[PDB]
Amino acid sequence: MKGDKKVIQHLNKILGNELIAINQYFLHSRMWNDWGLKRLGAHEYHESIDEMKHADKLIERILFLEGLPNLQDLGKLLIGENTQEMLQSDLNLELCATKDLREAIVHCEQVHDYVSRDLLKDILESEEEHIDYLETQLGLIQKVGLENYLQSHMHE
Template sequence: MKGNEKLINVLNDLLADELTAISQYMVHSEMCNNWGYNKLHEAIEKQAIDEMHHAEWLIQRILFLEGTPIVNKLKEMKIGKSVPDFIYNDQAAEQDAIKAYNKGIALAREVGDESTAELLTKILKMEEDHVDWAETQRAQIEQMGLEGYLSNQV
C-alpha cells in the first residue's frame, strides 16, 4: 500500500530518534552495570528494549507503506557522566519524542492514515511512561538525596 511520502519521512525521523535512544540507553545502562547499580541497569536496559520494539514497529510500518527505512542516521546522543545526568538527558529525549509523536499522529490523521496514527499513539503512551519513570527517579533523588537513592540501586 503506497503511503503518504511526507508521513513516511516523519516515520523515518521518528525511527532515527528511536535508534538514537537505543544507543543512549544502552550506554547509560552499561555504565550503571559497571558501577554496580544493578536495579538501575535493568530498568534502563528495559527502556532500551522498549525503544527497540518501537524501531521495529516503525520499520514494519514504513515497509508496509512502501517506503525505505533509513537506519543509518542517528541524532546526537547525550551521554551523561553521572546517574542524575542520565536521567535528565533521557527524560529530555523522551519529552522531545512525545512532541514528535504528537505531530506524527496529527499528520497521520490529516492524511487519513488511521492505522499509522494508532501505532504512533501506542508508542506515544510508552514514551509517556518513560517520562513518568524519569520524573519518579528525579523525585526520589531529591527526597532521599543522591547517596540514598544510589544505595537503593545496588
C-alpha cells in the same frame, strides 16, 4: 507507493529518535552496571529493549507503505556523566521525542492514515510511561537524597 510521502518522512523521524534512544539507553545501562548500580542498569536495559521493539514496528510499517526505512542517520546521543545527568538526558530525549510523535499523529490524522496514527499513539503511551518513571526518579533523589537513592539501586 501507497504511503503518503510525509507520513513516511514522519515515521522515519520517529524511527530516528528510537535509534538514538536504543543506543543512549543501552550505554547508560552498561555504565550503571559498571558502577554497581544494578537496579538502574537492569531497568535501563529494559527501556532500551522497549525502544528496539518500537523501532521494529516502525520499520515494518514504513516498508508496508513502500518507503525506505532510514537506519543510516543516527542523531546525537547525550550521554550523562553521573546518574543525575543520565536520568536528565533520558528525560530530555523523551520530551523532544514525544513532541515529534504528536506532530506525526497530527499529520496522519490529516491524511486519514489511521493505522499509522494508532501505531504512533501506542509508542506515545510507552514514552509517557518512561517520562513518568524518569520524573519520579529525579523526584526521589530530591526526597531521599542522592546517596540514599543510589544505595537503593545497588541491588537488583
